[PDB]
Structure 1
Amino acid sequence: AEETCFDKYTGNTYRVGDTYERPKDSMIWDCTCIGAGRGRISCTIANRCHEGGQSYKIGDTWRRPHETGGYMLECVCLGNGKGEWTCKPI
């Protein structure tokens, strides 16, 4: 029988090597089923930004008012292993 990993957040089982997203609270984790006889799962946010209660992949963009409210910004998730982002007026 094929070995699996169980994810308590998605509520699903996965097979070894399977990759998936795990929503937990305001964040989305990139997870991989390893197994190792104990359903070992490795998850990472190293490649994501988490800002304004949303989750972004590298290069994803979002729109945000400038602090003054007079104009809209576009922000991009750069990541840099550190969840970094920047914005410019558009």
Structure 2
Amino acid sequence: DQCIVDDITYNVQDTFHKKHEEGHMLNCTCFGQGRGRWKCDPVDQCQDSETGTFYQIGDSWEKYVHGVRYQCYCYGRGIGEWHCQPLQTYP
């Protein structure tokens, strides 16, 4: 048996990632069972409350809001945890 997903063929027991249509990341397994059955779970990841954009653990990004630029980081930590800091010049 094999799984077919977004035109990609998987062997039974394969694991893979897939982006959901709404933008977030999934981790998936190919089960097969006679009908190429597969399932995907959302992974732990962050969602920017303003832009709706998803970021993966370890990703950083900049927000430009209230006329202020910030740098943000996705920690995850099982709760899609992220934080930002104002853009800052250093020596």
TM-score, normalisation: structure 2: 0.69
Residue 75 (structure 1) shift:
0.9
TM-score (norm 1): 0.70
Alpha-carbon distance in structure 2 between the residues aligned to 1:26 and 1:59: 17
Q: Counterpart of 1:58 in structure 2: which amino acid? A: I
Correspondence for 1:4: 2
CA RMSD of aligned residues (A): 2.1
Q: Paired residues, what number?
A: 84
State the structure with more CA Rg.
Answer: 2
Moved over 6 A (4+): none
Q: SS at 1:24's partner residue?
A: coil
List alignment gaps of at least 5 residues for structure 2: none
Deviation at 1:13, TM superposition (A): 2.9
Q: How far apart are the structure 2 equivalents of 1:56 and 1:34? A: 28
Q: Give ranges in structure 1 of 5+ residues lacking alignment.
A: none
